[PDB]
Ligand binder design. Sequence first.
Ligand SMILES: NC(=O)C1=CN([C@@H]2O[C@H](COP(=O)(O)OP(=O)(O)OC[C@H]3O[C@@H](n4cnc5c(N)ncnc54)[C@H](OP(=O)(O)O)[C@@H]3O)[C@@H](O)[C@H]2O)C=CC1
Ligand SMILES: NC(=O)C1=CN([C@@H]2O[C@H](COP(=O)(O)OP(=O)(O)OC[C@H]3O[C@@H](n4cnc5c(N)ncnc54)[C@H](OP(=O)(O)O)[C@@H]3O)[C@@H](O)[C@H]2O)C=CC1
Ligand SMILES: CCc1nc(N)nc(N)c1Cc1cccc(-c2cccc(C(=O)O)c2)c1
Ligand SMILES: CCc1nc(N)nc(N)c1Cc1cccc(-c2cccc(C(=O)O)c2)c1
Ligand SMILES: O=c1ccn([C@H]2C[C@H](O)[C@@H](COP(=O)(O)O)O2)c(=O)[nH]1
Ligand SMILES: O=c1ccn([C@H]2C[C@H](O)[C@@H](COP(=O)(O)O)O2)c(=O)[nH]1
Lengths: 526, 528
Amino acid sequence: MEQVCDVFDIYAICACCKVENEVFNNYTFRGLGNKGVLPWKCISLDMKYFRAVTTYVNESKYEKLKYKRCKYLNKETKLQNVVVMGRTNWESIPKKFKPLSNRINVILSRTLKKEDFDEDVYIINKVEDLIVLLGKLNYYKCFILGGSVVYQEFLEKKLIKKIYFTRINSTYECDVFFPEINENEYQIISVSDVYTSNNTTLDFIIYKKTEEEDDFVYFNFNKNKNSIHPNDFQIYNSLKYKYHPEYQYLNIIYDIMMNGNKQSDRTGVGVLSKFGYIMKFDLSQYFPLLTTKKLFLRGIIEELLWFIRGETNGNTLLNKNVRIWEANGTREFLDNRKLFHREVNDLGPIYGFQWRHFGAEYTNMYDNYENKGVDQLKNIINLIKNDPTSRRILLCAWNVKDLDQMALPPCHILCQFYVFDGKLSCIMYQRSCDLGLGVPFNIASYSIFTHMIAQVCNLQPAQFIHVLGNAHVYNNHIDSLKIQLNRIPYPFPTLKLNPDIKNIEDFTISDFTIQNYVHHEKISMD
Amino acid sequence: QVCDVFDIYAICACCKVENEVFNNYTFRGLGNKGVLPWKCISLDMKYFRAVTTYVNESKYEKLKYKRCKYLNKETVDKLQNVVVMGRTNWESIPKKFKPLSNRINVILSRTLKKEDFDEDVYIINKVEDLIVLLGKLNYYKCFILGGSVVYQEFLEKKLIKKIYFTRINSTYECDVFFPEINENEYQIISVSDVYTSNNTTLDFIIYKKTDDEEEDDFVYFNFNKENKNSIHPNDFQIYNSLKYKYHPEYQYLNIIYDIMMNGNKQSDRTGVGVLSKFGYIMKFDLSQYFPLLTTKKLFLRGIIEELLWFIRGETNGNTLLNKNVRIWEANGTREFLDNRKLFHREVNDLGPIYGFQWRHFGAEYTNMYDNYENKGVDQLKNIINLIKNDPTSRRILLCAWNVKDLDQMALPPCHILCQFYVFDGKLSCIMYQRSCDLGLGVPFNIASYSIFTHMIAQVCNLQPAQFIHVLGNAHVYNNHIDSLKIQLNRIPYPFPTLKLNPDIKNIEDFTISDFTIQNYVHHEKISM
Ligand SMILES: NC(=O)C1=CN([C@@H]2O[C@H](COP(=O)(O)OP(=O)(O)OC[C@H]3O[C@@H](n4cnc5c(N)ncnc54)[C@H](OP(=O)(O)O)[C@@H]3O)[C@@H](O)[C@H]2O)C=CC1
Ligand SMILES: NC(=O)C1=CN([C@@H]2O[C@H](COP(=O)(O)OP(=O)(O)OC[C@H]3O[C@@H](n4cnc5c(N)ncnc54)[C@H](OP(=O)(O)O)[C@@H]3O)[C@@H](O)[C@H]2O)C=CC1
Ligand SMILES: CCc1nc(N)nc(N)c1Cc1cccc(-c2cccc(C(=O)O)c2)c1
Ligand SMILES: CCc1nc(N)nc(N)c1Cc1cccc(-c2cccc(C(=O)O)c2)c1
Ligand SMILES: O=c1ccn([C@H]2C[C@H](O)[C@@H](COP(=O)(O)O)O2)c(=O)[nH]1
Ligand SMILES: O=c1ccn([C@H]2C[C@H](O)[C@@H](COP(=O)(O)O)O2)c(=O)[nH]1
């Protein structure tokens, strides 16, 4: 008829870390505590979150809660929340925080009774006594704070209506663990933005138990296009709040699937296409390596270093077993570009040559172009250092003169940089965007490049901003992207650079570390 | 009050009538010679039927409750709306539409007999008889449909809760007019998107008499979202008093507001100081309007000449100056060039700027008088050919940022590139701007590249779709702040329209006389 946890609004809130090429799932985050305390030193942002949720009340909503609880109990006609702790949980809290401020404190125990406590707290020695207590109290909501024993038995008994679950994206030694959530009993309905706090990333997810209004209608008086189906996005559409920054990428895919224009293309596969998007990623808070599928970064980092050296020799990448440019360097591909006098894997005056030698005459991939052309990479590093408010800090790969000599014209047209308050942001304009295959890597590439330029200019990375021009999904990718859109992102990883690298030319592959990459399974887009 | 008890609204449509000053009264034409002043404008008709038939039955129980208590009753003893038409208005409606479908028809008439119409059609003979009739009916809301007499008397009797006012942005001969809405009595609260229907733009404004399981979760996710810039948002009383701000000019205005509220204080070369942010997109639908800002006056002749000068490939600033187009004057002075270290550059020789790069990218620049025929890459020709011959190309770009020539330019281009996109016979254009003077430069820039998109689309036999503006370093000069505060609190008018001479089929064949702005309605000019 009614559930106890719905009448009395019984929630659980917790924070779980990871515990010691692996496979990941929701149970990856399950570390609760260690040796009777928390596994980590204070993660302060989670404490602020935990305090806002457990202390927040809305007075205007109590009368309905009050009415509803009377009806269930068969009774007639400042506000605070109730919080429930195991006895072990209670003893691990620092004394200066007890009783938890502005909350009604309740402790479960058998070995201790109210005579053993100095504080303003309720003792109860069984779960049934909490329901009795709640029927007699005036309160807004009831939050179960753990520990592990308390969680397990409240989940066991179907007494939890929502789990407020912080995912701590780092590994610690643990000896107690959140119960394995039964995906048939609970589903994720919301996921927050990603944050960094105390040298770890984290997000907040929510499991749920499984007049001027008419003017709006008037103004919408004038509102199965692409053969895409509802049930094919059930998980994606069931989420209420989608604040994880990975949704900037997934929503654009959704948008192209549901509203894109059908078109042919140079390749003949055919695409759905739209025109003009912007994504923004906060590199101060996370490294935006996509988590709804597995991505590798060694190739794109070697590519970036190969760019910065000004190289155009495709053999250099192939010798590191990086095959990104291999198809663009074959005799057949070059011939079909009319590059009949071009040696195999000589890609012509592409990215690297334009960044270090714009306007120089290209000869072959072995020439020494020292002091030919405009070394715009050096120029923009100098403007950032010495003229940070300049609105001319731009790095351009679209050299109109050289386009036909390139193996193919650049997609990443330009980077513009912005400096404020000791922090560096970067816009990259992409003329053509393969959303299913290329954009994931391109986000990672320029995100890394922003870190490198910021460090050698002694700035901190801020936003990477990604403007998409012709944004398209290949029809060959649609079934894979349907799978991918129905996965829930994980908290992003972090990127660390060797801090002793002071000049842009001095990085090597080993100066980069990606830490705490948690990700869904690899996907063949075909 | 009566009109709040019984939910009495007015709904009307007004055209313009036969340096002009504009105001809300500019739109006041109701009828002419017993008919509507215009041929049918189908979009306003669709909105009309929608407003006057829409009913939310779940919301009626409280309206019935409210009306009964007002009348000291307990009962009123399918929910439709009520519609009130004057007799002139009622008789001039085509026969096959009367009685108005799914509406309770009510007619003010001192000469019509209750007999000649069915029992479902009501006939009153004074205004207070409607209040009596509303006391005895079940209805959602009561709409006053006109005509001029009915508007005037209902309005001077303070019997109107809101006005749903369609602004028809064209001119017609009229002999009856809406009453001048006293802005001390009513005020605009919501403004719609701009539209094109039957060869006129129009918009829709609203005048006003003067699971919470997921509500809490919203609060928690805001737990860290703890105004910073010495701006007092009470200076934007009108702006923040609006409820629905759907006019596409709000794309521009919302960005000024964002930079004021949240911009970063930075200095610049002139010491003036700016508020800046990084990264915006605006999109304007050229199929439905020409986005010439209306919250201040904008002139376009110089803007068009500069474009034509670009297309000719010119770099000689004297050409513009002899036409009194002075956009580039300050960049061509002896002093400005010397500061650029261009010691060997003639005054007003701007070097290899836009026009030279569009028609001659990669050519060696000598001076502004040289013959550059067939030197360098003719990008403009190239992209026009790609549009016509390979329209699904993702390489249709027009780039002015020639890294090799920047230092020889009087200054590097602010408009880095245009990219084009073709689908189903329609042309859209993205322009990326590295540096955006929101107060002065950006309004002109939206117009320049909106026009350019029309020109490219016509010489390619395409229709213009969107113009899409990407702002890089976006700034408000500190000395514009007072002027933009005034501008944020003006309500835009429906946009004008751009017409090109349809005979021009080559990008190089346009002349100044081939461009006409139609029905530009605007607020007064502002010195920034
Ligand atoms: N990261 C997080 O989100 C959280 C972490 N933690 C960590 O978890 C650990 C503590 O959790 P845990 O070790 O599982 O111990 P708990 O905090 O779960 O409390 C255990 C004790 O609570 C009492 N108790 C539990 N259920 C009942 C009941 N039905 N009736 C009566 N008394 C009851 C008993 O106390 P008695 O023995 O006196 O009967 C039991 O021994 C610590 O490491 C703590 O720091 C704690 C909370 C949340
Ligand atoms: N686009 C728009 O927004 C609208 C346009 N129109 C146009 O408006 C024009 C009509 O202007 P108008 O002539 O002012 O139309 P009206 O309907 O305002 O004519 C008023 C009539 O209503 C009756 N009436 C007025 N006041 C009273 C009263 N206090 N008590 C009783 N009966 C009353 C009289 O009928 P009697 O003669 O029997 O006394 C009078 O002739 C037409 O050209 C029509 O096309 C129509 C509706 C709205
Ligand atoms: C890691 C923390 C945490 N985060 C989240 N999201 N859920 C949790 N169940 C906990 C653990 C917890 C439980 C009970 C009280 C405290 C506590 C500590 C110190 C001070 C206070 C206070 O309220 O001042 C509370 C922590
Ligand atoms: C110019 C139109 C208009 N727009 C708006 N916004 N307000 C208006 N007062 C009118 C004029 C009007 C008034 C009464 C009935 C009709 C009518 C005509 C033909 C058919 C129907 C119908 O309902 O089928 C109604 C028009
Ligand atoms: O870094 C890259 C390089 C290529 N592409 C994709 C976009 C297009 O699908 C294709 C290039 O095609 P053109 O736009 O040049 O035709 O490769 C990317 O998304 N990112
Ligand atoms: O067409 C133009 C030309 C200039 N500006 C403004 C932007 C900057 O305020 C200034 C450009 O100077 P720098 O970005 O080079 O500093 O001119 C525009 O907004 N639009």
